[PDB]
Amino acid sequence: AVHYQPASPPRDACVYSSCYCEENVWKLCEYIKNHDQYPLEECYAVFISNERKMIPIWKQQARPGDGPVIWDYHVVLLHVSSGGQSFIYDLDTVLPFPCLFDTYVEDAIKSDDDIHPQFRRKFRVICADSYLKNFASDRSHMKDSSGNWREPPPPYPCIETGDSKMNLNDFISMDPKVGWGAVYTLSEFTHRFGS
């Protein structure tokens, strides 16, 4: 659908802290829930990681022109629009915000075929309503031994729920028996959402 209206504000107006992608995506989900543009049911938080927590992603703001960046995990927002098309909202991409799903997979993710197997990408896809209901982080993974902050934490209170003050590892995990949502290989992920 060629007149797609973004589900979020423009990039420069969105809540963002570098290296807190899980929260940046949570805040996009909250915005969408709080507005009347799109049903929340059309939206997903997507964690990208693997067993070794070393995943390349290209077209990244942290290293433009000379990708990939190797992340422990990265999180983006996926919107499956009614118009025949999914879109990726990744505040850390140099691709457009938002970006057509097929373009994001082609240019940011790329094929796993010739990637060293321990760097191959898996995807945990969580419905946005479930992500808002269930996610919790006390940010403790970003404080080192010293104990200093690896990157400055966001200024608003930690996201917590009645059931947990910290379950980030259950979203980073690509073990299908753990956590919420469904875990997909790159092939299964593109089969589900690709055009």
Side-chain angles (χ1 to χ4, degrees):
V2 300
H3 296 97
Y4 181 68
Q5 297 310 130
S8 69
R11 185 198 292 273
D12 63 15
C14 291
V15 177
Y16 174 84
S17 284
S18 171
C19 297
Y20 297 80
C21 53
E22 67 287 342
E23 304 198 18
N24 298 337
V25 168
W26 193 99
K27 285 286 174 175
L28 297 168
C29 293
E30 175 184 48
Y31 180 91
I32 294 164
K33 186 180 156 285
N34 289 352
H35 288 79
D36 287 332
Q37 191 183 9
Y38 294 117
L40 196 57
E41 297 58 52
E42 297 182 353
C43 299
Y44 300 89
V46 178
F47 280 65
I48 312 172
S49 193
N50 58 22
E51 170 184 352
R52 294 313 172 184
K53 290 167 70 182
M54 282 181 284
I55 45 130
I57 310 166
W58 285 263
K59 299 288 183 177
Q60 281 278 301
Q61 298 265 348
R63 194 174 174 79
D66 194 42
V69 174
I70 310 299
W71 287 112
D72 54 348
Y73 68 96
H74 189 54
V75 189
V76 304
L77 166 68
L78 194 154
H79 178 212
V80 180
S81 93
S82 57
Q85 217 123 58
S86 295
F87 291 86
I88 293 288
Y89 292 72
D90 180 5
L91 289 159
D92 284 305
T93 191
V94 306
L95 291 166
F97 182 84
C99 185
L100 283 159
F101 179 89
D102 286 347
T103 298
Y104 193 84
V105 171
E106 285 161 12
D107 290 352
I109 300 301
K110 308 194 174 189
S111 179
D112 270 346
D113 287 358
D114 289 314
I115 290 187
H116 172 67
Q118 292 170 305
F119 293 132
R120 290 176 172 166
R121 273 62 59 80
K122 296 190 172 195
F123 298 79
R124 178 184 289 276
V125 177
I126 310 103
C127 298
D129 61 349
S130 177
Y131 189 57
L132 291 174
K133 185 174 180 170
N134 294 128
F135 181 74
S137 175
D138 68 2
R139 301 170 179 151
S140 61
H141 64 297
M142 297 293 284
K143 225 202 308 169
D144 69 27
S145 322
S146 279
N148 301 319
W149 294 95
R150 303 177 208 276
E151 298 293 341
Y156 53 84
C158 286
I159 296 161
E160 56 179 287
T161 71
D163 282 352
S164 181
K165 288 174 195 276
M166 177 52 150
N167 57 22
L168 177 61
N169 285 345
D170 298 336
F171 292 80
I172 296 170
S173 174
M174 297 289 132
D175 181 346
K177 291 176 185 176
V178 168
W180 290 269
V183 176
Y184 294 96
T185 60
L186 174 56
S187 172
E188 294 159 359
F189 179 69
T190 61
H191 196 256
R192 176 171 172 196
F193 293 111
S195 286

